[PDB]
Amino acid sequence: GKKPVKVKTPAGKEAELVPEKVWALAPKGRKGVKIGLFKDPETGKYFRHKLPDDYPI
DNA sequence: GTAATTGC
DNA sequence: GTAATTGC
């Protein structure tokens, strides 16, 4: 389930974007975080950003 | 270092 | 090959 995520673009605007790809980033034995790959919708620049912990992977 | 991911 | 992304 790839629902939109409220993120801040590297331009500095709040935007609800569907991530292109999501995965967990976690050392062994750690909870870690969830990461998404996003494309800025007007500049076209790719960037990574943390996702909420409840986001489906 | 660490964990995975991938556009650059 | 690795910058950049979180958290410890």
Residue numbers in the entry: 4 to 60
Manuscript excerpt for this entry:
Crenarchaea, one of the two major phyla of cultured archaea, possesses a number of small and basic chromatin proteins, including Sul7d, CC1 and Cren7. In Sulfolobus solfataricus P2, a model strain of Crenarchaeota, Cren7 is synthesized in abundance, constituting ~1% of the total cellular proteins. This protein preferentially binds dsDNA over ssDNA and changes the DNA geometry in vitro. Similar to other Cren7-DNA complexes reported previously, Cren7 binds to the mismatched DNA duplex in the minor groove as a monomer, covering almost all the eight base pairs.
In the crystal of Cren7-GTAATTGC, one protein-DNA complex is found in the asymmetric unit. In crystals, binding of Cren7 to the AT-rich DNA duplex (GTAATTGC) induced opening of T2:G15 but not T10:G7 base pair. Among the most notable structural features of the Cren7-GTAATTGC complex is the flipping of the pyrimidine ring of T2. By contrast, the G15:T2 base pair in this complex appears a totally different conformation with an unusual hydrogen bonding geometry instead of the wobble type. The hydrogen bond from G-O6 to T-N3 has been broken, whereas the G-N1 to T-O2 hydrogen bond (2.75 Å) remains intact. Intriguingly, the hydrogen bond to T-O2 is bifurcated as an additional hydrogen bond is formed from G-N2 to this atom (2.58 Å). Notably, the opening angle of T2:G15 is ~45°, in marked contrast to the slight negative angle of other T:G base pairs. Only three residues on the loop, A29, P30 and K31, are involved in protein-DNA contacts, whereas the hydrogen bonds between the side chain of R33 and the bases of G1 and C16 no longer exist. The distortion of T2:G15 base pair in GTAATTGC leads to the B to A transformation of the G1pT2pA3 steps in addition to the A3pA4 step, while the later is the unique step undergoing this type of transformation in other DNA sequences bound by Cren7. By contrast, the binding affinity of Cren7 for GTAATTGC was 4.6-fold lower than that for the matched DNA.
